[PDB]
Design a protein around this ligand. Structure first.
Ligand SMILES: Nc1ncnc2c1ncn2[C@@H]1O[C@H](COP(=O)(O)OP(=O)(O)OC[C@H]2O[C@@H]([n+]3cccc(C(=O)O)c3)[C@H](O)[C@@H]2O)[C@@H](O)[C@H]1O
Ligand SMILES: Nc1ncnc2c1ncn2[C@@H]1O[C@H](COP(=O)(O)OP(=O)(O)OC[C@H]2O[C@@H]([n+]3cccc(C(=O)O)c3)[C@H](O)[C@@H]2O)[C@@H](O)[C@H]1O
Ligand SMILES: Nc1ncnc2c1ncn2[C@@H]1O[C@H](COP(=O)(O)CP(=O)(O)OP(=O)(O)O)[C@@H](O)[C@H]1O
Ligand SMILES: Nc1ncnc2c1ncn2[C@@H]1O[C@H](COP(=O)(O)CP(=O)(O)OP(=O)(O)O)[C@@H](O)[C@H]1O
Lengths: 661, 650, 340
């Protein structure tokens, strides 16, 4: 049914910030540069194209703004653009000095498919330092009503919203340069009122440090207002009588930079990006204090006039102009990954420090198997003990062989108290007592077989902890919590405190890597740790590759995206190993590509297990700290959900919407 | 420091609804009856005394209301009352027809220590059926400003609140009769504005079914408005030209009847009760939607004028005019207890029914020891399975001897699948392997270990059996132990109620005579508290904390008044007189120290990782996903210190 | 005439963001950690000392916030602080859950020289993801009037300004955590109204990426509002039942970071910096569109209640807690100089 490969059908909207070639005092020329750029935008299937402040006249022409011949030329040019726009897909937002009542206003003219939808005047006009705007032009704040343009009356003022009737995630608001720099910018009221994509036309003569100012204010705006912020500044061609221009364009989404263009270009430049309207939708649905703010400023926010237009965007495959990282929990950029690891580790450590202080420094009891999770937790434990001036011998590490050598090597190198307890006999006794086929020689490696052993490990650890005055450290990770890959209750799901509960599996390996690199525990410890990595990396058979499951988990836990949307995203991230970026630590022989067919398959498994099967294991969860901004799975925190629900609707959405391959 | 035995110092406020002797047309007489009744109220240490509609004139005198000599006499009487009040403790709320601007209003005059604090006019004046009030008197809704009374200007209107400066829990609002009968009564606005005690002066000629109307409206008002509602109607002495009068008085608190007086009495009557202002405070602190409602009507609610007075109540022991039941979770009244039991049981059962349906009808695995909790759970399980048309043999009951016979008897009688597994050897093996209290724990844990493994093996879920009182006190073996399970039908039922639920199941007689006999034996046989105190006291403290969050000294005061004397108050059914203990302050204090330490500090972590199961009691349950969100790593120092400082040692 | 070497006489005001040692559920303890830190601030000649969200109770105690004994203890502790403050120089801004009308509000109590100047309730209470604030506490937005505290009626609400009568460059406004995260934060109205130093008490359980969020919003706030922004988050001692805490403190001025403290410290930490009130004064005098914005929201901005206090700061040499670069046109940092 749905065209699976169409960005528009998954709730993206393609936006462009353009910097044209200014020809000061020559509107026909500026209009020509605009028309050519708008045609490119059309070709790219964009829905929106934002130009620089006072586009049609040039921002820097000062008193030439007041010349009748200039103002008349601007009108002529604007009407031709409007006429050409009948054949263009995107809504064009073009700057122009325009006559209304007594004066000329610094306006942005919102143009679409042959009509002017609205005209929006700058609200705050800088008249200080290099800025003289109040000399030529009038403030817009507080103007309402209509304005006459090519024999039509069209909405005029600071209170406008342009809403796409066939694309509700897309609601446009426009402001101009200085507007975003004052304590209470028009766009903040607009977002509370329903605007999701905020436009800014800017002239912005460039100086040292100013591009940082622009980024600080556009970025913070996108974040605080849970919105896209689309920004375009003037460039080559503006007068250099007292100023220079850099042509900067940028597109922001909720704090993140989607795109930006070359500063000081030779020639016109565009930023083109696919904004995820569902991402904005999801952020807002969850952050009730955003709506609370709206209600507080109800009078302000209900006064907006909503102007409708029908975008009717391209239905087909037009790619996805957006960076989709393979590991939502593991940034590919090394500066950022280093930071994330630093914070994850310190979260884990100090979380445990406080549990320890509160229990007047119990011993720490932990099962160590030489695998990734328990290795990392033993490290966390040791650091906590160190920072609290506790002897490392109060950490009681246990190997619990059933029916590798890294575990004792690590424990000996850290200098914790090591000990082995073979649970085989306890296991045989229990298997025979409940009458299981293995006790009678049959090779039935059941779920009860695997479970009796798993259970007996936790049983032992808990009893030792009662006996020796300790608490049992859990080692289960978030990806395990997500998928119900735990032995519930009497088993590895259960513990006194779980330092790993909020760390997804894809991040664990990078936390260990990080501890080695800090080099804090010395060379001997680093070598064992390194061996753990090398050994353990090279279950996954039943629940899928954790890379794919960690990807779906982030989408669901943070945004609640529907399955078809998660598949579209994962595919764009994973299907081609040569595209996008890998974090550090992925030798090229461990850089897999997944097909739609696979991504689909693992996702069916994921929704069934996450939404339905596994919640009961999460429901009775031991304490432990949240780590990732994506969320954690504590039924006391980020995820409150029924333990007895079917996942039918998610599975059915996959049947209907995701192609088989 | 605190006088522990003083109701006032524990945040009670003593209120009185009075019905005097009406002498129609004779204000001096009415004032005399009022002054005598006000003096009783004073002697009783009351803070408030509410009289009937139009007290000083008589409500029923019709056009006699418009006679100058009558209105003049009313004023003379009112002024003497005010003068006498200089020596009286309670705020007096006295009815009177009063001249203002063009007309007479139907007013209540709020009088205190020599001064008139305010004058409040009836808002809605019935003029239909037996009622002709708009013929003589003016509506007060919308009137503001002041009124001149004995040469002083005093607040006048529907927007008044009288707040005790030295007793913030006590904020009075007054309305009159009909006022509480309209879709949007003045008292509802007042409560949103801060009023905690709502007064109603009423004339209210009596007819068949009218007392029920008054109860329905006063009671629902007190509940919706999280308030005391204090009500007084006219009695003997009003004219019987076309009507009769019953003199009813009543005092309500958040839906509950605190007190009421004899209908159709010969002579004057009072209702006197201690309202718990902390209770109201607690209810409102918790129900945010109450404040939300206030904010939505902000204009309405901020317009109130708050008038201050200093009550300066008695500091000493004046007893407690309030019924404090011994078992907050177990009503002493048999009708009500039967109802609670019926509800609790059906909650447990249908909670488990849904788990089973969702898991496509797994077997139910349960450890049965022949004690109260597991017995009851097995019963619940059987019913659930019955209602879902599941064979009882899918219930796998297990005796798990360590290092009684009721258990197998019960299981055989119900016809579930019974089985014994001796865990002693598995225990010995484990104790030896770790090189061995932890003794009691190894066994407790191995039971749960086995149950879980059997459930994996035989396709079942393990039923928990831990009760709420065990959850409250941390009397569980955590994680690998009896705290852990796949679904816990008992988690929300406190121990004091368990025995009554069983008693109930016998009395319904639903499972037959043979089963009833075993169940009965479980009761007789089984009826820990060694280390954590009598569950009766701990269930008392639990309800106080979990519902109202009362401070320890306040919990001790309440528990003492309920428990210290076995002959006072009422016992629920099923307490033979040899099992009817009295506790001293010293004991109640002792167990409470244990309680706060264990509840606030030690035990939360066990509650934090709690299996699913249904909330049962209005008092609350202890799910960290529901009624109780709290830190697992907190000290209880401040509660223990509050006991040191405020509760006497004996 | 002027003491040339006195930071105060050249229009600086010394501010502190403090992270104390939380003892959940123990107000006397929290008060003790506060008093000790406030005394340090006094010794340092600070005019202002901002503590973490819900200081006196601990931010993370959830339903324990609703327990009578806890609320009573908070009151007792608050009054002792107020009494001790008679001998302290700086205005103290201390967090506390406080009873008013029907509920408890998440408040910051502005305390100075023996008196409470005002009580300020959080406006927006997060009830999503890890946040459950609306379960225990009431929203402050729109509350006005007074509140009774130790037998005095003091201003209550979101519309307060505390102005130093002898130091006009210093006009304080207080908000709380989430307040600065919404599209139209209380502090932006406050700055238009005349606030120059914006305080934020925060609990802010820490996660990956959150310190960046805090910096983005505090920094942009300081810049757009031409103001100092003084920020303090909870640290060691808050419950780690589901969350960790990092104790971050920071002081911002018009986009620039004046000071910040160690993240995840062992022990209490302070950020102490000299804010240049003349710098803020000058920025505002020149940027007329700031005042234009105020005029546009005239109704909003004139409704603020201005509460006066006399700081009477130290007249002598107390150094200058501020980085003053030798070459205003040539940044000393190489990354930044390369960019310039
Ligand atoms: N909704 C619900 N509410 C309450 N109880 C529910 C339930 N659904 C199933 N149950 C019950 O819970 C039990 C099923 O859960 P459980 O027995 O824990 O486990 P289950 O999912 O049946 O099997 C556990 C599997 O997880 C894997 N595992 C185990 C241990 C460690 C790791 C690791 O690498 O970290 C992986 C291992 O392959 C094993 O086969 C059954 O007794 C079932 O009747
Ligand atoms: N705040 C905290 N956060 C995380 N972990 C904490 C902790 N405090 C203790 N711990 C740890 O938890 C363990 C202590 O808890 P737990 O293992 O439950 O043991 P605990 O409560 O000390 O022992 C249970 C008591 O209850 C009795 N019991 C046992 C079995 C059934 C029943 C019954 O009638 O229902 C009664 C038994 O005789 C024993 O005296 C220790 O290992 C301790 O170090
Ligand atoms: N042989 C063994 N010795 C000690 N502890 C063991 C153990 N096998 C399992 N455990 C405990 O049970 C937990 C889960 O066991 P497994 O499912 O086998 C994961 P793993 O493959 O051991 O590596 P991991 O530590 O990266 O999870 C471990 O983290 C460990 O604490
Ligand atoms: N000997 C035994 N055989 C089978 N199950 C047992 C058992 N002892 C304890 N259990 C199970 O473990 C739970 C907790 O143990 P206890 O509280 O010590 C039992 P109790 O108080 O004797 O009976 P009760 O649980 O019915 O009140 C019981 O509810 C029961 O389900």
């Amino acid at each position: 049914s749905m065209n699976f490969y169409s960005a528009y059908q998954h709730g993206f909207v393609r936006v462009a910030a353009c910097t044209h070639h200014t020809t000061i005092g020559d509107p026909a020329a500026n209009a020509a540069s605009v028309l050519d750029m708008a045609r490119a935008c059309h070709d790219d299937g964009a829905a929106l194209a934002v130009f620089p402040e006072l586009t049609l006249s040039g921002y820097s022409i000062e008193d030439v703004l007041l010349q009748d011949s200039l103002l008349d030329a601007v009108e002529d040019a604007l009407l031709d653009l409007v006429t050409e726009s009948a054949d263009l897909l995107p809504v064009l937002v073009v700057g122009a000095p325009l006559r209304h009542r007594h004066r000329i206003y610094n306006t942005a003219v919102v143009i679409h498919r042959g009509a002017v939808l609205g005209v929006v005047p700058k609200s705050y006009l800088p008249t200080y330092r290099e800025f003289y705007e109040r000399r030529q032009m009038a403030p817009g704040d507080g103007e309402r009503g209509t304005i006459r343009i090519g024999g039509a009356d069209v909405a005029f003022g600071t209170d406008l919203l342009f809403a796409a009737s066939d694309l509700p995630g897309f609601v446009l608001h426009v402001e101009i340069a200085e507007d975003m720099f004052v304590p209470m910018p028009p766009s903040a009221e607009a977002a509370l009122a329903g605007a999701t994509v905020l436009a800014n036309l800017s002239g912005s003569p460039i100086t040292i440090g100013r591009a940082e100012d622009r980024r600080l204010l556009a970025r913070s705006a996108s974040a605080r207002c849970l919105a896209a912020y689309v920004y375009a500044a003037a460039g080559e061609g503006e007068s250099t009588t007292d100023l220079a221009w850099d042509g900067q364009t940028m597109i922001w989404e909720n704090g993140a930079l989607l795109a930006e263009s070359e500063r000081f270009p030779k020639g016109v430049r565009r930023s083109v990006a696919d904004v995820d309207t569902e991402l904005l939708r999801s952020e807002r649905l969850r952050m009730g204090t955003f709506d609370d703010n709206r209600r507080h400023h109800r009078e302000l926010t209900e006064s907006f006039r909503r102007i409708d237009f029908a975008l009717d965007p391209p239905a087909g495959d037009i790619g996805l102009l957006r960076e989709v990282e393979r590991f939502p929990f593991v940034p590919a950029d090394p500066q950022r990954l280093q930071q994330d690891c630093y914070e994850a580790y310190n979260i884990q450590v100090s979380g445990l420090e406080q549990r320890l202080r509160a229990l007047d420094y119990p011993k720490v009891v932990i099962g160590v198997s030489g695998g990734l999770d328990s290795t990392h937790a033993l490290i966390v434990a040791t650091h906590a003990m160190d920072r609290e001036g506790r002897p490392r011998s109060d950490i009681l590490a246990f190997a619990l062989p059933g029916f590798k050598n890294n575990a004792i090597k690590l424990a000996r190198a850290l200098g914790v108290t090591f000990s082995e307890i073979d649970i085989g006999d306890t296991a045989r006794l229990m298997l025979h007592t409940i009458g299981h086929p293995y006790s009678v020689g049959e090779k039935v490696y059941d779920v009860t077989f695997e479970n009796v052993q798993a259970g007996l490990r936790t049983d032992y650890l808990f009893r030792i902890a009662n006996q020796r005055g300790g608490i049992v450290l859990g080692t289960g990770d978030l990806s395990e919590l997500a998928l119900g890959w735990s032995t519930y209750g009497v088993g590895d799901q259960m513990s006194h405190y779980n330092v790993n509960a909020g760390v997804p599996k894809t991040l664990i390996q990078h936390l260990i890597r990080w501890v080695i690199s800090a080099g804090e525990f010395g060379e001997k410890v680093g070598e064992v740790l390194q061996s753990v990595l090398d050994t353990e990396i090279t279950s996954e058979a039943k629940v899928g590759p954790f890379a794919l499951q960690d990807f779906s988990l982030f989408q669901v836990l943070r945004y609640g995206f529907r399955p078809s949307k998660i598949a579209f995203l994962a595919w764009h991230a994973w299907n081609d190993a040569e595209r996008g970026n890998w974090p550090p630590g992925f030798p090229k022989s461990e850089r897999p590509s997944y097909s739609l067919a696979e991504i689909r398959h693992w996702l069916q498994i994921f929704v069934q297990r996450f939404y339905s099967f596994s919640q009961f294991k999460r429901s009775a969860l031991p304490n432990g700290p949240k780590v990732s901004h994506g969320g954690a799975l504590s039924p006391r925190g980020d995820w409150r959900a029924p333990s007895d629900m079917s996942a039918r609707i998610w599975l059915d959405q996959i049947d209907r919407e995701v192609p088989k391959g």
